[PDB]
C-alpha cells in the first residue's frame, strides 16, 4: 500500500495473509472455512494466516491453518487477468471473534463515487522497495468506468473496476494482490493489477466481486 496509514492491530479482522514460507498475497475471510483471493496468487502449498498484524512476530491472536483445496475460477485468463478470483478452503474452521471475523459478500454492485478501504502488507514505495511488517490501510473511491477505460484503453472488462486517485501517490502495490476492497461493510473488490504503483493516470484495477456471488455461493455449497 503506497500513501496509506497503519491500520492498527486487528482493525481489519477479515484480512488474511497467504504464506508459503513467506507472505506472498492477501485474501479475505468469507466464512469460517473459506478465503477469497486473486487467481494470479495461486500456488501449491498455501498456509492461511488469520489474526495477523505484524507478520514477522507472534503477537497472540494468530490462527495458522493449511488450505485443503484451492479452486481457481473456471474462466481465469492469466494474460488479461480477466476473472482474477480464486477460492481457498481451510483444512479446519477458523475460530471467529472480534479480531477474526468474516466479511459479507455484496447484494449489489457498488457505484463510482463510493469510498472503500483497501489493506495489505504490500510495498509502500512507488519507486524502489520497502515492505512493512504491519498491516497498511488506504481509503479510496471507486472511479467511473469511463475514467477507468480511458486510463487503460483496451484492457478493462466488465469484471474489473478501478479505484484510487488519477493524481497518483496513493494505491495498492505488489504484495497487496488478492486482498480486500471493502465498501460499506461488504467485499466489493480484490486487489488484481495496475501499471506500476501510485503513478499518475494509472489507478489500481480490482476484480468486481459482485459478478461472482452466485459462483462463490454455489462453489462453497458443493465443496
Ligand atoms: C500484486 O500485489 C500485484 C499488483 C497489484 C495491484 C497493483 C496496483 N498498482 N494497484 C500493482 C501490482 C502481486 O501479485 O503481488
Ligand atoms: Ca503475527
Amino acid at each position: 500500500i503506497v500513501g496509506g496509514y497503519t491500520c492498527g492491530a486487528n482493525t481489519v479482522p477479515y484480512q488474511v495473509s497467504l504464506n508459503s514460507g513467506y507472505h506472498f498475497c492477501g485474501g479475505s475471510l468469507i466464512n469460517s472455512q473459506w478465503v477469497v483471493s486473486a487467481a494470479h496468487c495461486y500456488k501449491s502449498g498455501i498456509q492461511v494466516r488469520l489474526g495477523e498484524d505484524n507478520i514477522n512476530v507472534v503477537e497472540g491472536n494468530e490462527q495458522f491453518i493449511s488450505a485443503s483445496k484451492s479452486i481457481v475460477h473456471p474462466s481465469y485468463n492469466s494474460n488479461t487477468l480477466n476473472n482474477d478470483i480464486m477460492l481457498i478452503k481451510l483444512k479446519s474452521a477458523a475460530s471467529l471473534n472480534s479480531r477474526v471475523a468474516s466479511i459479507s459478500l455484496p447484494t449489489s454492485c457498488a457505484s463510482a463515487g463510493t469510498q472503500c478501504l483497501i489493506s495489505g502488507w504490500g510495498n509502500t514505495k512507488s519507486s524502489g522497495t520497502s515492505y512493512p511488517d504491519v498491516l497498511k490501510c488506504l481509503k479510496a473511491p471507486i472511479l467511473s468506468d469511463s475514467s477507468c477505460k480511458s486510463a487503460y484503453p483496451g484492457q478493462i472488462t466488465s469484471n474489473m473496476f478501478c479505484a484510487g486517485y488519477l493524481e497518483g501517490g496513493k494505491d495498492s502495490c505488489q504484495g497487496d494482490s488478492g486482498g480486500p476492497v471493502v465498501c460499506s461493510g461488504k467485499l466489493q473488490g480484490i486487489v488484481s493489477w495496475g501499471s506500476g504503483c501510485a503513478q499518475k493516470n494509472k489507478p489500481g484495477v480490482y476484480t468486481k466481486v459482485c459478478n461472482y456471488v452466485s459462483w462463490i455461493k454455489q462453489t462453497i455449497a458443493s465443496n
Side-chain angles (χ1 to χ4, degrees):
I1 300 292
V2 190
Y5 54 103
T6 289
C7 301
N10 312 298
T11 61
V12 188
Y14 48 85
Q15 169 74 220
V16 323
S17 163
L18 298 192
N19 186 291
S20 59
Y22 50 88
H23 169 78
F24 67 93
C25 262
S28 304
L29 193 60
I30 63 180
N31 64 241
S32 58
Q33 250 194 119
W34 293 90
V35 167
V36 61
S37 194
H40 83 263
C41 282
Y42 168 76
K43 284 197 176 293
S44 175
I46 306 178
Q47 188 177 226
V48 180
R49 306 192 161 205
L50 306 191
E52 287 293 357
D53 189 54
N54 187 314
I55 59 174
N56 274 320
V57 185
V58 166
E59 310 174 292
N61 291 303
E62 303 99 332
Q63 301 181 51
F64 295 161
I65 308 169
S66 307
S68 56
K69 179 160 50 190
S70 182
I71 305 173
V72 156
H73 203 273
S75 291
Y76 165 62
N77 185 323
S78 54
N79 290 146
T80 67
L81 294 177
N82 196 203
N83 302 118
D84 193 3
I85 186 167
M86 158 176 76
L87 286 167
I88 297 177
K89 187 175 189 181
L90 303 177
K91 280 181 181 181
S92 298
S95 303
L96 303 188
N97 74 301
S98 61
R99 298 172 164 164
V100 174
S102 56
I103 192 65
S104 302
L105 287 185
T107 59
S108 56
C109 301
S111 295
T114 310
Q115 196 201 64
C116 299
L117 182 61
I118 298 165
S119 48
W121 291 274
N123 192 8
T124 64
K125 297 308 167 188
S126 64
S127 303
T129 291
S130 181
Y131 278 83
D133 289 332
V134 288
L135 183 69
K136 298 289 188 183
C137 280
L138 182 59
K139 291 184 183 191
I142 299 173
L143 303 174
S144 65
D145 155 277
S146 303
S147 64
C148 187
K149 280 170 178 302
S150 59
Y152 296 104
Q155 297 157 268
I156 304 305
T157 73
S158 75
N159 299 300
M160 298 173 191
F161 68 88
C162 295
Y165 296 91
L166 292 174
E167 315 69 45
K170 297 187 170 185
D171 196 358
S172 59
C173 206
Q174 305 115 193
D176 291 305
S177 276
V181 184
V182 162
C183 319
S184 316
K186 302 295 182 137
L187 182 70
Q188 294 288 183
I190 304 164
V191 183
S192 183
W193 59 276
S195 189
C197 313
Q199 254 58 269
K200 183 183 180 182
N201 287 320
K202 291 292 176 185
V205 188
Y206 292 91
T207 306
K208 202 176 192 180
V209 176
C210 64
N211 281 26
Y212 299 104
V213 164
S214 301
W215 172 78
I216 298 172
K217 286 195 173 186
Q218 176 61 57
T219 294
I220 274 40
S222 287
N223 293 268

